[PDB]
Amino acid sequence: PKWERTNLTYRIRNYTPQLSEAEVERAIKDAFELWSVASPLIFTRISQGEADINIAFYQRDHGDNSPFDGPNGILAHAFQPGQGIGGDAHFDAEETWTNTSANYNLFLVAAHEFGHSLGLAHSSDPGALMYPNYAFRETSNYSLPQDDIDGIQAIYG
Numbered sequence: 488p489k490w491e492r493t494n495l496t497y498r499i500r501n502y503t504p505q506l507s508e509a510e511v512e513r514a515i516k517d518a519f520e521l522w523s524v525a526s527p528l529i530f531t532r533i534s535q536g537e538a539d540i541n542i543a544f545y546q547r548d549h550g551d552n553s554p555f556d557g558p559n560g561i562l563a564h565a566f567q568p569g570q571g572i573g574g575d576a577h578f579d580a581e582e583t584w585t586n587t588s589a590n591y592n593l594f595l596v597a598a599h600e601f602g603h604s605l606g607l608a609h610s611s612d613p614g615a616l617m618y619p620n621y622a623f624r625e626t627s628n629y630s631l632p633q634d635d636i637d638g639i640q641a642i643y644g
């Protein structure tokens with residue numbers, strides 16, 4: 488699965504109250520930019536209406552047959568490129584969401600989920616963003632690990 492348009496829209500449908508709205512918006516924007524700088528994709532935010540990629544914070548059963556599980560465990564999930572639910576990214580509202588090294592950093596989690604939104608599966612490289620399990624990495628000048636660059640380059644050339 489892969490997108491056939493280069494300019495994709497996204498919409499943040501709701502917000503965790505644990506971060507300022509500005510910090511939620513910056514986490515999401517920066518997570519998309521990680522992939523944009525390694526691909527031809529251009530991400531465009533809309534405030535209402537139907538976007539290619541919906542982003543939301545939900546708890547437990549939330550209408551897609553993949554319920555969240557409360558604190559810890561599954562932090563978020565995302566759907567492969569396609570119409571409707573395709574591309575969408577959901578975050579477990581019951582987590583602690585941070586902009587620090589404390590569990591769990593929203594920017595890093597979003598970055599992983601957006602890999603799925605663009606067509607990547609999990610990686611077996613423990614250093615890869617797309618590794619199945621979360622590990623905090625310094626965020627200040629974070630760039631995609633080389634394994635993830637390889638992955639998105641394989642899809643979008």
Ligand SMILES: [Ca+2]
Pocket residue numbers: 555556557558559560561562579581582
């Ligand atoms: Ca959870």
Ligand SMILES: [Ca+2]
Pocket residue numbers: 538539540541569570571572573574575
């Ligand atoms: Ca969608």
Ligand SMILES: [Zn+2]
Pocket residue numbers: 549551553564577
């Ligand atoms: Zn979901």
Ligand SMILES: [Zn+2]
Pocket residue numbers: 599600603609619
């Ligand atoms: Zn994943």
